[PDB]
Amino acid sequence: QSYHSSIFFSISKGSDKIGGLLEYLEIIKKHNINITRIESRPSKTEKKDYDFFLDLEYPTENNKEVEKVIKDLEEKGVKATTLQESSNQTYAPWFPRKISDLDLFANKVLEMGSDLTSDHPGASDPVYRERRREIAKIASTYKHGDEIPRIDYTEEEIKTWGVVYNRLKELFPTNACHQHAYIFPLLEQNCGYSPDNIPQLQDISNFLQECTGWRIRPVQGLLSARDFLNGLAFRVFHATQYIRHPSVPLYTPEPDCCHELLGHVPLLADPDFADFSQEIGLASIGASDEDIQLLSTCYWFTVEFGLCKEGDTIRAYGAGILSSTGEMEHFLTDKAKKLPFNPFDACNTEYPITTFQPLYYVAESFQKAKEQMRQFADSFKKPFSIRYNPYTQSIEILDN
Amino acid sequence: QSYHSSIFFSISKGSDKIGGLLEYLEIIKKHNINITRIESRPSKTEKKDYDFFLDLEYPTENNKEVEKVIKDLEEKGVKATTLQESSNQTYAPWFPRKISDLDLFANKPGASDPVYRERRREIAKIASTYKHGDEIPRIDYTEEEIKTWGVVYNRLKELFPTNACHQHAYIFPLLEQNCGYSPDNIPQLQDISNFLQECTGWRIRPVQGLLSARDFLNGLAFRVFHATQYIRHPSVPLYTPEPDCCHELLGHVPLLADPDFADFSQEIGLASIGASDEDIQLLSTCYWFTVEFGLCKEGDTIRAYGAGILSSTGEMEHFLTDKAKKLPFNPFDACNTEYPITTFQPLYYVAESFQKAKEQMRQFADSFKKPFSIRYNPYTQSIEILDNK
Numbered sequence A: 001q002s003y004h005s006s007i008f009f010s011i012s013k014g015s016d017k018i019g020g021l022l023e024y025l026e027i028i029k030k031h032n033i034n035i036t037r038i039e040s041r042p043s044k045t046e047k048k049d050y051d052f053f054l055d056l057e058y059p060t061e062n063n064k065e066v067e068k069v070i071k072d073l074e075e076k077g078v079k080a081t082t083l084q085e086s087s088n089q090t091y092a093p094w095f096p097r098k099i100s101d102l103d104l105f106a107n108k109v110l111e112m113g114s115d116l117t118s119d120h121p122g123a124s125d126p127v128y129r130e131r132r133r134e135i136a137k138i139a140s141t142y143k144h145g146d147e148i149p150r151i152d153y154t155e156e157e158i159k160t161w162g163v164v165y166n167r168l169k170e171l172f173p174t175n176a177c178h179q180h181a182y183i184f185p186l187l188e189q190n191c192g193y194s195p196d197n198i199p200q201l202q203d204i205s206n207f208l209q210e211c212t213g214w215r216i217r218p219v220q221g222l223l224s225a226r227d228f229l230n231g232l233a234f235r236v237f238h239a240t241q242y243i244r245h246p247s248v249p250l251y252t253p254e255p256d257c258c259h260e261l262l263g264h265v266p267l268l269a270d271p272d273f274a275d276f277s278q279e280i281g282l283a284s285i286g287a288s289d290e291d292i293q294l295l296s297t298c299y300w301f302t303v304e305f306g307l308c309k310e311g312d313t314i315r316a317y318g319a320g321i322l323s324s325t326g327e328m329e330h331f332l333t334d335k336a337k338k339l340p341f342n343p344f345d346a347c348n349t350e351y352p353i354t355t356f357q358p359l360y361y362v363a364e365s366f367q368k369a370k371e372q373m374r375q376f377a378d379s380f381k382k383p384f385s386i387r388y389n390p391y392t393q394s395i396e397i398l399d400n
Numbered sequence B: 001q002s003y004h005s006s007i008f009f010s011i012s013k014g015s016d017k018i019g020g021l022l023e024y025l026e027i028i029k030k031h032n033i034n035i036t037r038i039e040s041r042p043s044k045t046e047k048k049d050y051d052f053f054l055d056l057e058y059p060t061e062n063n064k065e066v067e068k069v070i071k072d073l074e075e076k077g078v079k080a081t082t083l084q085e086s087s088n089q090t091y092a093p094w095f096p097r098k099i100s101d102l103d104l105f106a107n108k109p110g111a112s113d114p115v116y117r118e119r120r121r122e123i124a125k126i127a128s129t130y131k132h133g134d135e136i137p138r139i140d141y142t143e144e145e146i147k148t149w150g151v152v153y154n155r156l157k158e159l160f161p162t163n164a165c166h167q168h169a170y171i172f173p174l175l176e177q178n179c180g181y182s183p184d185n186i187p188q189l190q191d192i193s194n195f196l197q198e199c200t201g202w203r204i205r206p207v208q209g210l211l212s213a214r215d216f217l218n219g220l221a222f223r224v225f226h227a228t229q230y231i232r233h234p235s236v237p238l239y240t241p242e243p244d245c246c247h248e249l250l251g252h253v254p255l256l257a258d259p260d261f262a263d264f265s266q267e268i269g270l271a272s273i274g275a276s277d278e279d280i281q282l283l284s285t286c287y288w289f290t291v292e293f294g295l296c297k298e299g300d301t302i303r304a305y306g307a308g309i310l311s312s313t314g315e316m317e318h319f320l321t322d323k324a325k326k327l328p329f330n331p332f333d334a335c336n337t338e339y340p341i342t343t344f345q346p347l348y349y350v351a352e353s354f355q356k357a358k359e360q361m362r363q364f365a366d367s368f369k370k371p372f373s374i375r376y377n378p379y380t381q382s383i384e385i386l387d388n389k
């Protein structure tokens, strides 16, 4: 594995330091074995300035080489700011800058890829293990700009999907929030949602891009929370392509395609939910490890297991609920507590990952949850503020 | 050659007619080979409504079969609005709705040199393979072509600092540093597109066939610039009317990296989306007196931002002369001003600022008759159609 650092600085058009700076950069472009990219762009905050971006990768954490680069660079008369992937707090946390920089995550999957747990129903199924390998390879080799490869799903795989699909769809009209009921016929009409067929990520991605500008990247398995959440800042949802083992169709701890496509996807075609999800993403950009953990908890209690109130009734929008017959049939009962959602209240709350939730949070609306997440993000100590530019598909850094 | 039609209609959630509607749509999809696409989306106005889009393609103009489809469709209980590519005015003008639809445009002094004419065909062939989503194919330029680029480059670079608007001087070193701009090498469109995308969201497509004014201007609405890759004949010194790659890359491209200019250019494109033929002509002429031959005001000086000035030494010399008339840019004045294409311009229009020109264009285009309100959504990168007319 590798650790990324980024160095950035600005210089005004017409500075007599530009000539020497460019010479210095050409040198390290050729001779520095950790430099991966050097780019310059118009400043987004000062019309007469240029921004420079230096990206590096190092084999070890806290690699003292970057200090050498900073020193050399500042001898050319510019003031560098450095971001780094690290457990240390020497520099503020690194983040991907460009939507295409999500390619860096491609081979960073923690678990639930082609390495299964011994109690996994398919752990000793040689055909299933080979399949998981095959499908994982696709995510590992996927690049921004590519079409997502279509999977030729087998008859057994399609059968498992159908069992899940048919069980869940009976419960949606009575248990899901109305945005789900609004969006679902469009998925049938445009993305091939049906019991007889597993929808392809590329079709879903195209549909979401045109609705809310969200898009899908295939992923091997679980990413780290920072990486997954950072992807959300770009309105990019990482989704798996494999399906759960046929022997246990009504439950799995893994985010298989049933969970992604039936739980996560529909709400992303709703503009307010889409903005809310991106807000969570933006909050994570360059956030401390502590705050990432708070954001994961907020995500759990909203995107994964959130409830909405409609009149006197409670409905589910959380993906973990919408994709589980158990959970759908649990939340409506008085067997679980409900509280109004508030990131300052919810972020500290504990939760089980191997049972139904004993506590759910109810959001008033996705617009209010968005505004609430922005208050939360602002309460973080961040070295700078950030801003998404949909035209350039890029994070812009702002002072203070 | 193909004539595209589009049929739009809306239907409410929980309508009684949806079932039969969907059935009808699935049958014609299967059995009508002229139906290329049928799609439905959330409405941009009524939160409870669905928008439907039917795309059709026929070999001839004003195909009577469209009417038949409108009829059967409207029998299922919806009110259809039809747009069409046609020289007639039975239907309002068709337009591309997403960036990939620009694929539909694709098929559509010493030039009497057989080698050079064979070369032009070859470059067109290499370009002809491009479709949205691809990398723009690179051109392996010949030794002579690169030599010609070098002469034009070095000459024009001598004049820019004293004659070009400040945005051009600002961006050019970035083109040098990130896109390989130099006199020794011709930059490839794919590198330029990537850089533009990362500055202002603008993209390049290679020119395949030559584009109608409607098609080219419609491209601008998606912040897509069509650019040619061929290089001028050597017998062309500076033809001082030569829309080759030198003109695209040294003239048009640098300004597209300026955020305000990039918005102004797209504004012209938006105005063109679904505009009548006579309104398209107004916009082409506005485009000529701005994007191609416009001047800017810099303090007490006049400078050039027009690509046709920036890529012509003769034009750059000519605009500052007193015999060249200058006027403040006003689209109502500029839009029906006649102009020469094979001589220097006797008249130039001067823009105060690109944000002002953008606002002027939007005001200019506000009364254009259209069946729909048109707008651009930066998150979806698509045209939103509002049925509020």
Ligand SMILES: O=S(=O)(O)CCN1CCN(CCS(=O)(=O)O)CC1
Pocket (backbone or CB within 6 Å): A211, A212, A213, A271, A274, A275, B377, B379, B380
């Ligand atoms: O419906 S679509 O998904 O196509 C675009 C929805 N759009 C997203 C961006 N926000 C403002 C961003 S912010 O200023 O609140 O950060 C307005 C609503």
Ligand SMILES: O=S(=O)(O)CCN1CCN(CCS(=O)(=O)O)CC1
Pocket (backbone or CB within 6 Å): A389, A391, A392, B199, B200, B201, B258, B259, B260, B262, B263
């Ligand atoms: O592409 S860039 O990131 O460089 C700037 C994109 N540009 C910014 C300014 N807004 C003005 C909307 S309005 O002022 O007309 O309402 C249009 C989009």
Ligand SMILES: [Fe+3]
Pocket (backbone or CB within 6 Å): A255, A259, A264, A304, A319, A320
């Ligand atoms: Fe999930």
Ligand SMILES: [Fe+3]
Pocket (backbone or CB within 6 Å): B243, B247, B252, B292, B307, B308
């Ligand atoms: Fe031109």
